[PDB]
Design a protein around this ligand. Structure first.
Ligand code: GSH
Ligand code: GSH
Length: 226
């Protein structure tokens, strides 16, 4: 016995596939991690406004910040898990990452590239520090002292949370778009960032909600060319 849920997300270039839409992917991830039954319909953007929107027991919801808080609240225990993070810093971290990428990827002045890359890099470093630094709840299993490097799987702990549902779609877009148009690789030295990405891309709830890389590339084909 579940509620009736259809999530409407943005379609990709063929009008049917999953398109590039990080807020759509965020809600898709939330619903999957809740364990609730739901259908996903893609909307060809070539009623409401832009996706995502959601129909929940026959009622249309279009304010998508409000969709997130409604799902988290509504779909509650005992039946479904709360997905909110233990620590707020799990949200706060990376809150500026996408904006720094957005400036960098649309910069058309080759001479400013180094400065824009440095600004993106400063945010990656901040995320990396959050991910390598043990959370307050972490106890090394061999020594019972606080680990010298965090080994938790995700932002907030060993389970995917709302924080991950928000950030991972943004990280995928950055990874794909920046590589294609600026030949940028997330530095290998950001060992926490990569621990997190390898763990996340190991999860079907993340990888199978990603659009094909080409969709993301198509998004930036006209803004990211210098
Ligand atoms: N800010 C520069 C010149 C290159 C540049 O455009 N940098 C950036 C990216 S961090 C910027 O905010 N541009 C200011 C502008 O709009 O001209 C420098 O350090 O010499
Ligand atoms: N409308 C579908 C998108 C739906 C979709 O791709 N859902 C997949 C992700 S690839 C899924 O794993 N859904 C399982 C679930 O609802 O739990 C399409 O043909 O592109």
């Amino acid at each position: 016995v579940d509620p009736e849920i259809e999530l409407f997300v943005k379609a990709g270039s063929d009008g049917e596939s999953i398109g590039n839409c990080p807020f759509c992917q965020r809600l898709f991830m939330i619903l999957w991690l809740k364990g609730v039954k739901f259908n996903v319909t893609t909307v060809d953007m070539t009623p409401g406004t832009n996706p995502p929107f959601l129909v929940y027991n026959k009622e249309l919801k279009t304010d998508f910040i409000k969709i997130e808080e409604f799902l988290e609240q509504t779909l509650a225990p005992p039946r479904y898990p709360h997905l909110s993070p233990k620590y707020k810093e799990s949200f706060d971290v990376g809150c500026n990452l996408f904006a720094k990428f957005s400036a960098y990827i649309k910069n058309t002045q080759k001479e400013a590239n180094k400065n824009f890359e440095k600004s993106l890099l400063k945010e990656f470093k901040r995320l990396d520090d959050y991910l390598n630094t043990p959370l307050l709840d972490e106890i090394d299993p061999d020594s019972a002292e606080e680990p010298p490097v965090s080994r938790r799987l995700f932002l907030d702990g060993d389970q995917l949370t709302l924080a991950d549902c928000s950030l991972l779609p943004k990280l995928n877009i950055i990874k794909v778009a920046a590589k294609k148009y600026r030949d940028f690789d997330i530095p290998a030295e950001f060992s926490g960032v990569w621990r997190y990405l390898h763990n996340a891309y190991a999860r079907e709830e993340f990888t199978h909600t990603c659009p094909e890389d080409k969709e993301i590339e198509n998004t930036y084909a006209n803004v990211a060319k210098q």
